[PDB]
Enzyme design. Structure first.
Site, PDB file in Angstrom:
ATOM      1  CD  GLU A  31      49.860  56.167  28.179  1.00 48.55           C
ATOM      2  OE1 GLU A  31      50.727  55.349  28.360  1.00 48.55           O
ATOM      3  OE2 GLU A  31      49.909  56.955  27.227  1.00 48.55           O
ATOM      4  CD  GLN A  50      40.163  34.854  32.260  1.00 45.55           C
ATOM      5  OE1 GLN A  50      40.418  33.636  31.763  1.00 45.55           O
ATOM      6  NE2 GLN A  50      39.270  35.036  33.443  1.00 45.55           N
ATOM      7  CG  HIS A  65      42.669  32.065  45.054  1.00 48.66           C
ATOM      8  ND1 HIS A  65      41.553  32.852  45.078  1.00 48.66           N
ATOM      9  CD2 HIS A  65      42.131  31.173  46.175  1.00 48.66           C
ATOM     10  CE1 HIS A  65      40.678  32.488  46.041  1.00 48.66           C
ATOM     11  NE2 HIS A  65      41.041  31.554  46.628  1.00 48.66           N
ATOM     12  CE  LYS A  74      46.137  35.511  39.974  1.00 46.00           C
ATOM     13  NZ  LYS A  74      46.182  34.457  41.137  1.00 46.00           N
ATOM     14  CE1 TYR A 134      42.635  37.922  38.465  1.00 51.90           C
ATOM     15  CE2 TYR A 134      40.957  39.374  39.437  1.00 51.90           C
ATOM     16  CZ  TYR A 134      41.323  37.997  39.110  1.00 51.90           C
ATOM     17  OH  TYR A 134      40.622  36.881  39.365  1.00 51.90           O
ATOM     18  CG  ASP A 171      39.158  31.579  49.501  1.00 52.83           C
ATOM     19  OD1 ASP A 171      39.438  30.637  48.770  1.00 52.83           O
ATOM     20  OD2 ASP A 171      38.818  32.642  49.025  1.00 52.83           O
TER      21      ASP A 171
END
Ligand SMILES: Cc1cn([C@H]2C[C@H](O)[C@@H](COP(=O)(O)OP(=O)(O)O[C@H]3O[C@@H](C)[C@H](O)[C@@H](O)[C@H]3O)O2)c(=O)[nH]c1=O
Ligand SMILES: Cc1cn([C@H]2C[C@H](O)[C@@H](COP(=O)(O)OP(=O)(O)O[C@H]3O[C@@H](C)[C@H](O)[C@@H](O)[C@H]3O)O2)c(=O)[nH]c1=O
Lengths: 184, 184
Positions: A31, A50, A65, A74, A134, A171
């Site tokens: 899982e 998402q 970020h 996240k 993620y 970046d």
């Protein structure tokens, strides 16, 4: 019962997860997420809207970020290779403001990190290649995207890197922490 | 806008998804799930409460599985290798009752299948190895697990298989379709 070990990191709201992988003669099963266990360790409800999947070569660094509005909590992991995964606390009113935590996540150890809204996030690739997946609590919104430069001298993140990293131009052009938009 | 091609299969409620993968000199990035696009193609709301990840060797077959209570709608894909992925309509009152659909899903084509509650699901591995991930609308409940045998003569599924498949014992002992618990 079988589930998922949970450890709060040095910055308590960041959590490291470790799943149980069950082997049999076909292969394995685990899982990768369970809402009951997640909300129990998290202590509050969460909906993920998402899921994202990226592939990066050795020495690639993506970060640091965040989205200053439509902020994204996240839950992150690697399914191919190994990365060093970093969370920076950008909440001005937190007692750990300006501090960071980092862990090695890999296809083999299967460990995950939960990073609440209020944090900057980045990773660097340590193997030949790495695939990084993620789940996020809000949608992509470019207009709200912000970046802090990876090698900021105030943050002093101990990247386990050999050569100079490959970065996107945005970046490379990241803000200094002292000039960055932060959370309350 | 960039998103996800959606195709309804021969059994309309089964949907095949195909994402856009954006390349750059670090590697690639894609959205593996987006709730706005999914619910728009689906035509109704969905919450996924559990994510699962399995690895299987060539010729392994897992199926044909469903939960007769706490029934699980499933969104599925492969991130390593290639599988043939099958959905069987077990809704007695559907005009496509006893019919099935199958598509090749791979790490390379990145295609996904949405399988609503009311269906049995199975896959077989065509490459040296395959890793198979999926999101479900309810939790694991062994007491409610049921199985139909992969080679049922009424279903007549056209597996693209060379040798006899490797199965769990409970899959080898699956019920005949004629004796199986079905949905309304
Ligand atoms: C972030 C994102 C990008 N894209 C597209 C836009 C670009 O064409 C391509 C790559 O965009 P980039 O912003 O360069 O991706 P990136 O991998 O550098 O950005 C990501 O880095 C992670 C470290 C953070 O945690 C994420 O929140 C995100 O910022 O993907 C989406 O379609 N959806 C998204 O959610
Ligand atoms: C299905 C499942 C299994 N397990 C454990 C129990 C076993 O020790 C091990 C393997 O169990 P199995 O039932 O043999 O896994 P499996 O991969 O044969 O079962 C799965 O097959 C897919 C084709 C279906 O779509 C799924 O709904 C499920 O039935 O994993 C979980 O912890 N959670 C789960 O949700």
């Amino acid at each position: 019962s079988m589930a998922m070990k949970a450890t709060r990191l040095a910055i308590p709201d960041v959590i490291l997860f470790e799943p149980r992988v069950f082997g049999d003669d076909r292969g394995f099963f685990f899982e990768s997420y369970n809402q009951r266990a997640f909300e129990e360790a998290c202590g509050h409800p969460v909906s993920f809207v998402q899921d994202n999947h990226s592939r990066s070569a050795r020495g690639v660094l993506r970060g640091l970020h965040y989205q200053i509005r439509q902020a994204q909590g996240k839950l992150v992991r690697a399914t191919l290779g190994e990365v060093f995964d970093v969370a920076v606390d950008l909440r001005r009113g937190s007692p750990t403001f300006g501090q960071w935590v980092g862990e090695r996540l890999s296809a083999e150890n299967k460990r995950q990190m939960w990073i609440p809204a209020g944090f900057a996030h980045g990773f660097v690739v340590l193997s030949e290649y790495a695939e990084f997946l993620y789940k996020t609590t809000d949608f992509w919104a470019p207009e709200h995207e912000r970046c802090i430069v990876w090698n900021d001298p105030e943050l002093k993140i101990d990247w386990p890197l050999q050569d100079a990293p490959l970065l996107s131009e945005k970046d490379r052009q990241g803000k200094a922490f002292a000039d960055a938009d932060c959370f309350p």
